[PDB]
Design a protein around this ligand. Structure first.
Ligand SMILES: [Cu+2]
Ligand SMILES: [Cu+2]
Length: 128
């Protein structure tokens, strides 16, 4: 099966999908994020961050407090399973992670930690 997905964030706060499926036979998985908007990352930055559902709000809140220079992620945040850099217009970044970090039946969320963005810039990730 395919073990990658292409995700975009633009000059609005929604990703172009709200649900990612990771096939259970995949051993790694890659997310390729890009930003087809015109605004720079300090104004309309997006990252793609994966945590358990339970951990999402903490990661978002602590990430906002960490600021732009930390890509809006608390340093040494063990709650983050995988993530990309924060990108702006014209940029791109990919993350590959081990599917051994995921289990069937567990509830995962992906989201952007740029301030305010998680309200609309979030979705589920499911191993199946
Ligand atoms: Cu964002
Ligand atoms: Cu990191």
């Amino acid at each position: 099966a395919e073990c990658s997905v292409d995700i975009q964030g633009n000059d609005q706060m929604q990703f172009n999908t709200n649900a990612i499926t990771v096939d259970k036979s995949c051993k790694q998985f890659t997310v390729n994020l890009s930003h087809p908007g015109n605004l720079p990352k300090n104004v309309m930055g997006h990252n793609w961050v994966l945590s358990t559902a339970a951990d999402m709000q903490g990661v978002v809140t602590d990430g906002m407090a960490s600021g732009l220079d930390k890509d809006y992620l608390k340093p040494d945040d063990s709650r983050v399973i995988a993530h990309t850099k924060l990108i702006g217009s014209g940029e791109k970044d990919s993350v590959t992670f081990d599917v051994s970090k995921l289990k069937e039946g567990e509830q995962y969320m992906f989201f952007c930690t740029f301030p305010g963005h998680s309200a609309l810039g979030k979705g589920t990730l499911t191993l199946k």
